[PDB]
């Protein structure tokens, strides 16, 4: 009957509290059948724009191991994640390369993430002295200096704490609402490919 086994996209998508933007939890996924049909439905997940491979061909030309990331970002920064646009959150927190396979998944989370008291546990970076290459993380929290003089110490003028916060009160409209972007990455490294979709009958 060719009965199969699964690997947790239920942990990837239906987790309780996601990670922050500056330290996004990269998860490697191997040795599966990859049921993307749950991912394919446009009713739970509003945005499924794909760049490397088509959504129709996702159950073919299958890959070695896939990389699942995570985000909680505002609705005005979802378009920014995709390659070709540089801004303030895909330039210093998550740089995507010009040609890559795999694609973003964005859905609203006003019920699960927006708290009336507040949600100051999401942090991001908008000052960095250097820039980003594709696909690294910057967990370190040294104080950014905007001037020639060594400012240092507490956060004064031209000292900046580089980890700034979101504000997720539910009074805000569409545009500042948490859109939990999960971006997949597909790679074809020289190895026996073992993440490949369910053919069944």
């Amino acid at each position, epitope marked *: 009957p060719n009965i199969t086994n699964l690997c947790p996209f239920d942990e990837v998508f239906n987790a309780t509290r996601f990670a922050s933007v500056y330290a996004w939890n990269r998860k490697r996924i191997s040795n599966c059948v990859a049921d993307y049909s749950v991912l394919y439905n446009l009713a739970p997940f509003f945005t499924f724009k794909c760049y490397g491979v088509s959504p129709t061909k996702l159950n073919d030309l299958c890959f070695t191991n896939v990389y699942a990331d995570s985000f909680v970002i505002r609705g005005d920064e979802v378009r920014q994640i995709a390659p070709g646009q540089t801004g*303030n959150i895909a330039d210093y927190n998550y740089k995507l390369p010009d040609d890559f396979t795999g694609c973003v998944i964005a859905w609203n989370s006003n019920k699960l993430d927006s708290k009336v008291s507040g949600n100051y546990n999401y942090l991001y970076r908008l000052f960095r002295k250097s820039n980003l290459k594709p696909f690294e993380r910057d967990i370190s929290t040294e104080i950014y200096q905007a*001037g020639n003089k060594p400012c240092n110490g507490v*956060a004064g003028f*031209n000292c*900046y704490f580089p*980890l*700034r916060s979101y504000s997720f009160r539910p009074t805000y409209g569409v545009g500042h609402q948490p859109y939990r972007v999960v971006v997949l990455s597909f790679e074809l490294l020289h190895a026996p490919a073992t993440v490949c979709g369910p053919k069944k009958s």
Partner: antibody
Amino acid sequence: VQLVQSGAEVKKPGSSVKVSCKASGGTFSNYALSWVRQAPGQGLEWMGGIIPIFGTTNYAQKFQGRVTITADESTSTAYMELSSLRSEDTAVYYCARLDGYSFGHDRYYQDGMDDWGPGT
Amino acid sequence: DIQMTQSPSSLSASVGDRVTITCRASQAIRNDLGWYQQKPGKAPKCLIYAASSLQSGVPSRFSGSGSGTEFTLTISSLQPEDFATYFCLQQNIYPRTFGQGTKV
């Protein structure tokens, strides 16, 4: 959030001027507060900023030490002493919060608060 | 402290013209230029936050652009209350600069 401030002050030279503005409505003492001059025949000009929670002060060019700025977070009032007045140094004065970075709980409010005074 | 320069103040245009107000700095700052509309005898008002990002509560006839040192504001179509003066603010480093200029 609104800013109120006092009326017209001394014009005759040789004296020093106290001008103060108070943040009325949602008293926030973390964001940077700035002073802006405007002449009838000249554009806007920046002289100095104040952090009310820390008390650090940064000034403009060529008149560091002429400007003294005092902050009090308890009464939510910010004071401004400027000495050595000229006849050509007259301008209408504004206080503003044009920098959206809070130093207390790491928040960066994007709008820049649109904070401006009435103008005296 | 770096200075900024704008276009000269002699801009005069009718209703329905393309506007190309320039604003240039002397050091490669990312996007931190703001623009403020000032009417005579009135407090200023923000129009756009920083480069393309636009302030809430205004009509969408305004746009901004620029990534290096050259910075532009563009009006899509003019309005009867367009008669004003527009200022650049540096942000980023603290000594700052107010770039001046008017449009009649």
